[PDB]
Amino acid sequence: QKKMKSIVEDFLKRLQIFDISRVPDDQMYRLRDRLRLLPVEIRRLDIFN
Amino acid sequence: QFDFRASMHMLTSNLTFTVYSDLLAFVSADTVEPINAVAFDNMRIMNEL
């Protein structure tokens, strides 16, 4: 039931060079899809394990 | 001519009943949360979440 748009919004806002008001939701979900195929960092992955 | 024998009848019917018009008023209808609504293939209608 979780919509991951907030995660991508936080990501783009913390990049600090994009104005998220000009980023539509489909682009954010494409970013989510691309992020979903990346491996997790070793420390974060081990903490989650 | 009026004939009593040829005019006396026994009319038969039911004692009492109640007639209803709205059959669907007898159905309690609820819906799942739209986030969990699924299509004919049992997958969620919208999956880009």
Distance separating alpha carbons of residues A9 and B39, to the nearest angstrom: 29
Look up residue A4 and give its two tokens: 């991951």
Closest Cα in chain B to A6? B49
- The CA distance from A33 to the nearest CA of chain B, in Å, is 9
Instruction: Name residue, tokens 């009943």.
Output: B17
User: Smallest Cα–Cα separation from A34: which of A13, A8, A9?
Assistant: A8
- C-alpha dist (Å) from residue A10 to A6, A7, A18: 6, 5, 11
Nearest 10 degrees: Cα torsion A24, B48, B32, B21: 70
Determine the longest span between alpha carbons in chain A, in angstroms: 37
DSSP string, A7-45: HHHHHHHHH-S--GGG--HHHHHHHHHHHHTSPPPHHHH
Q: What would you report as the CA-atom Rg of chain B, rounded to the nearest whole angstrom?
A: 29
Resolution at which this structure was determined, Å: 2.7
Distance separating alpha carbons of residues A49 and B11, to the nearest angstrom: 84
Instruction: Name residue, tokens 């609820």.
Output: B30
Strand partners, B44: B38
Distance separating alpha carbons of residues A31 and A26, to the nearest angstrom: 9
Q: Which approach determined this entry?
A: cryo-EM
Chain B residues in contact with A29 (beta carbon < 8 A): 48
